[PDB]
Enzyme design. Structure first.
Site, PDB file in Angstrom:
ATOM      1  CG  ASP A 114      72.001 -49.050 -45.636  1.00 18.79           C
ATOM      2  OD1 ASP A 114      72.829 -48.142 -45.382  1.00 18.79           O
ATOM      3  OD2 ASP A 114      71.840 -50.241 -44.830  1.00 18.79           O
ATOM      4  CD  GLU A 173      75.220 -46.082 -48.103  1.00 18.06           C
ATOM      5  OE1 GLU A 173      74.130 -47.162 -47.947  1.00 18.06           O
ATOM      6  OE2 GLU A 173      76.498 -46.052 -47.173  1.00 18.06           O
TER       7      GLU A 173
END
Ligand SMILES: O=P(O)(O)O[C@H]1O[C@H](CO)[C@@H](O)[C@H](O)[C@H]1O
Ligand SMILES: OC[C@H]1O[C@H](O)[C@H](O)[C@@H](O)[C@@H]1O
Ligand code: NA
Ligand code: NA
Lengths: 479, 479, 479
Positions: free
Chosen positions: A189, A230
């Site tokens: 993330d 990501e």
């Protein structure tokens, strides 16, 4: 190696009430339609929908226990978030910093603004901002001292220091723990924000970004896991990831299709498919909303503005990136706050055509649960929680999912998902076909297995012809 | 031969409650202000504001009886719609197709998609059907068989087959019945789609479209009627109509005047008047709202975009042409949904000036009933029925019409209408006069009779001088 | 000769409830921060926010008495409006025209349209009128006779006739009366329209306009007063005024700074400062909308449009010039309806930096009261009363002003106002300094006194260094 099957993106407590209701819904409906799940952050968290974990080693009892996760691992791949950028301010590591000060054994785990000295206004303007505040939080220590730490997102999310050693230690500990629970795919993330160097953008700073990325990927490989970093920026960064044995995000696909379907134009879509990065995880909608910078280059700017203006009426206030002007800087359209189904004007034919094209795009397709259920914008939920992205984060009870699952459009989507998860041709090689500037022809071939998509963007028609190997004849998929 | 007088465009049930109340309204206010009526489709219909008639031989009892129709024919010309493209699926002829199948004597009346075989993606995208649907409806026969028929509009409108003979017979029968009831002028609804040929646009296909039109025109002339073909496309088609002894629509005028008034610019207006097609029926507003394609070429694209952007704030969502993702571009808007009076910012002077210029444009002037009554956008009605065009389809009770007739601006229009309907100079020849680039000078001369319009587009002034032959002096029309 | 000090632009009844509350508010906060006031029209008026006076010799009892006016004089300069173009239709002079007709001794005071005979269409289109009606009002006399008079603005404002003699006395009478009450500076409202000549624009007609303008200035000089002619057109007229011993308006400055700050561009600003007309009265916001034509030439068209597009979201509907159908074109907007504080996106730094540049621009700086209190767009006041310009005409109670004075941004502005009014260097000579194309360096020197502004348009930073004569050293002004 992961299963080449549709994956479900879903929260723990937003289908039913907890992880057990999620599993019950999967077996009743998805038992032969998905091969993996991306369960959104289910750790103890105090901010931002689970993305402020106090630890990656516990499950929030409100959601269930680790046994409830491992119930999925026996039959499905498991994708889980590793917040490599930040951990909670209520975490044990950061709470120890408040008590002991710089004498804490976890002091070098966090980014201290004072290392850099004076930061000129010019170097500030390079850094983009994800809230309306400078990325620096002033915390009060137990002894009364005031110091500031780096804080990209909401103030309960403290960024980690990848110029020191403790941060790599902490992540490697997390990775070992998660893979032991059956985790296949580590979604890194906000990976782009880990690289900080004053004088740079402090985002995707090269070549540091590739060193951090080669490190986690190697760490993931001992523990029997692959990575899904990501990053929301120009697609070239997706190719950099792909070219290092990691799975990039097909973030260019969602806004590309929205344009392609709305304007009956396959030129830019076909060009992208011909050159799209490989080993990627394709998505249409996510838990964040349609991100625009991910389609720069893939789609000309003038067409991007057309796309943004077309969604504007069907979308809430957009999420924006800003700089050292924060408060009142307008900024760059970052994400359109909108479900993917409302982005296609709730057109069942058009929405099924998007998913068909997604599923034939090379890579593992993820279906977000709201998209699975053809969900519309949740006005009421957004206005009560104030979170702008909750317009795409519908709550479904077990009642509401069973009924939405019976919608004609969802039955059509579940036919594709069964086809994409089971039909063996998708395990072969991709062969794009010639087509006019308003339609797409996509095919997969694995030996005698063969399937062929044809989508006419003028009339939003979807046709799949496949070869039944048990009889040798060519049949039409009914969807 | 029609009366060279103002015509009224009106629905059956939107002045009062029925055709009898309409007639009551005409005699009370308009008895010497119009020479004819275009009564919008008043047949038994099951879709699209009357344009899906089950037969042209019955009057929907909700509106009245044929005797209620003939009440107009003794004193006024009568314009009635002939849906040459399609008839209802509840019509006697199509219901027989569902019952008996291809054994029906009415089978060759409709277009069967399987006749064409495989249709290439290019030949599909050529097709001019504005829905995001293929123009094909799948119907289930009584015996269970599924077949597809051509369906341009809503699915309750089945397109007619002019490659066979039955369709011409049905039209000739409708024409005979309508003219026997006193119809002078047959508005050929949507004739442009009658021509189907795979590999063409299936819209205004030349030279077939003109054979269909020469045939209907001859059939109408036998029965004592003229034709008014409805086509919304490039004005070049309006001259083709004009040159085949049929009445074209002056669809270019409404947006041409809007620009001319809004911008105080007569250049493109005078240029059009100097070459406008003969024998046309001029309009400002219709029952559909201001159509853009009809002024392309007549008005430069950059000035059309000026028009579109200027009307956007005062108008509902525009009706769009297919796959138009650029929703603020001349090429995307099909019809602007707005009453003509709101399009001129409710400016009395400008609205009267527009009607004056319409009334001196060569051809039969139609006045739409909402325009007649200076009606504003009906927000409530559009929001109550979801039909976007009902913003231009106000309901008036007999009282509400009596009230609107007393508004100063409608009294003015009523004086112009009396002048255009009665003053004999319009039966002579049109002589455009010289003027500057911000004003128009128009005149008609028929023997000793002469009338002259002057409009200053800067100040929206309308000035008319006429010659009283019984006295020889030149008087000012007071309006 | 006026005080080289900040002036306050204010209404009589919009700070508190009347002129006495205004005097109370001025003394409480501004007693040594301004050197004069511009009190907007406080006469008996029946139209256009006070600009239709029945006489310049009375004060509307709703506002106070002349004694409330003289309370400001003796300590403050006094700027008052002289509507040289027009007086009210309820005025004593014009009512006598209605009663007696042309037998009135005040007949030659007004412009009679029939005097000119026929006016060709071209001569009408020349007339610089920003409304869509002929500037001609038809009045009904007491005896029933109908005649027409010239009427530029609203119909309650009848224009004066400077081809006769009565108009010059009425002004000389007004000026004599106003100066006798202590008025220093006569704002000549709308003087550009005093020149009427068929065949001309009837606006700023040369050289007649200077014939009229040199006359009033001397009559004002006779009575111990200077003039402030207001004209909104090309800046060339501002120097034309400047070169005749009158004070022009720095109308170019407001949109120039708005562009300069929004786009970080000092090029056009420095060019203007280097050559700006002086003995002008500088403003940022006024009682009117931000006026665009006043910056044509000073700012390139493409850069003006940058300004217009940036302000479009933070501003109400703009006031338009005549027949400007192209509502997104520099040549179409007349005034932007917006408070100056919202025009800079409520950025405290940017707003102060603008005021700093204003205060160092050569000429008398006026501060509008809404700007004084950092007021935002008043949606509520605008939607009531329908007046589009009331979005910039906030009402303040005495409490509401005391409260706004405590705003941090207003404290900073209040520091500048004291400095600009008191520090003696501003009584010397202006010297522009070198700087890059994204910053401005301005300085003033008067003997031993010296002060220096540096504004970085990239970051909206404001620094003023001055030489403190009370110590001889160079200090930083704290704002
Ligand atoms: O998808 P994005 O906008 O790039 O960033 C993502 O990570 C952030 C970290 O807290 C969160 O706000 C969300 O998970 C999401 O926005
Ligand atoms: O189906 C016929 C078409 O033309 C008609 O005039 C109407 O506008 C509408 O019913 C449709 O667009
Ligand atoms: Na489409
Ligand atoms: Na006009």
């Amino acid at each position: 190696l992961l299963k080449n099957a549709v994956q479900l993106i879903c929260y723990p407590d937003r289908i039913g009430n907890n992880l057990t209701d999620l599993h019950t819904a999967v077996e009743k409906h998805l038992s032969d339609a998905i091969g993996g799940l991306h369960i959104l952050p289910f750790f103890p968290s105090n901010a931002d929908g689970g993305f402020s974990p106090l630890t990656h080693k516990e499950v929030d009892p409100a959601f269930g226990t680790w046994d409830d996760i491992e119930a999925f691992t026996g039959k499905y791949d498991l994708c889980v978030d590793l917040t490599v950028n930040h951990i909670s301010d209520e975490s044990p590591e950061f709470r120890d910093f408040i008590a002991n000060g710089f004498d804490s054994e976890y002091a070098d785990l966090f980014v201290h603004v004072d290392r850099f000295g004076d930061i000129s206004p010019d170097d500030m303007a390079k850094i983009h901002i994800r809230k309306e505040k400078e990325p620096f939080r002033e915390v009060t220590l137990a002894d009364g001292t005031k110091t500031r730490v780096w804080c990209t997102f909401t103030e309960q999310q403290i960024d980690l220091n990848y110029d020191g050693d403790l941060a790599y230690r902490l992540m490697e500990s997390y990775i070992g723990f998660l893979t032991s629970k059956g985790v296949n795919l580590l979604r890194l993330d906000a990976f782009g924000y880990t690289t900080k160097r004053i004088g740079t953008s402090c985002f995707l700073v090269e070549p540091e970004v590739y060193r951090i990325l080669d490190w986690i990927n190697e760490v993931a490989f001992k523990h029997g896991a692959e990575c899904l970093p990501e990053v929301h920026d120009h697609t070239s960064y997706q190719y950099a990831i792909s070219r290092r044995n990691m799975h990039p995000y097909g973030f260019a696909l969602p806004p590309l299709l929205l344009y392609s379907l709305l304007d009956a134009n396959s030129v830019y879509l076909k060009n992208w498919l011909r050159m799209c990065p490989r080993n990627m995880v394709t998505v249409l909608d996510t838990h964040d909303g349609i991100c625009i910078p991910d389609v720069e280059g893939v789609l000309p700017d003038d067409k991007i503005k057309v796309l943004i203006d077309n969604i504007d009426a069907r979308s809430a206030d957009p999420i924006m990136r800003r700089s050292a002007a924060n408060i009142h800087s307008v900024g760059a359209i970052y994400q359109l706050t909108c479900t993917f189904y409302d982005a296609l004007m709730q057109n069942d034919d058009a929405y099924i055509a998007a998913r068909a094209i997604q599923f034939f795009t090379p890579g593992i397709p993820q279906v977000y649960y709201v998209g699975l259920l053809a969900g519309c914008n949740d006005q009421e939920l957004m206005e009560k929680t104030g979170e702008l992205r909750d317009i795409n984060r519908n709550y479904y009870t077990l009642n509401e999912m069973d009924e939405a699952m019976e919608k004609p459009v969802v039955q059509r989507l579940l036919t594709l998902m069964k086809f994409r998860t089971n039909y063996p041709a998708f395990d072969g090689h991709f062969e794009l076909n010639y087509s006019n500037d308003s339609s797409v022809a996509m095919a997969w071939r694995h030996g005698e297995h063969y399937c062929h998509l044809f989508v006419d963007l003028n009339f939003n028609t979807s046709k799949i012809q496949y070869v039944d190997v048990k009889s040798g004849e060519t049949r039409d998929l009914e969807f």
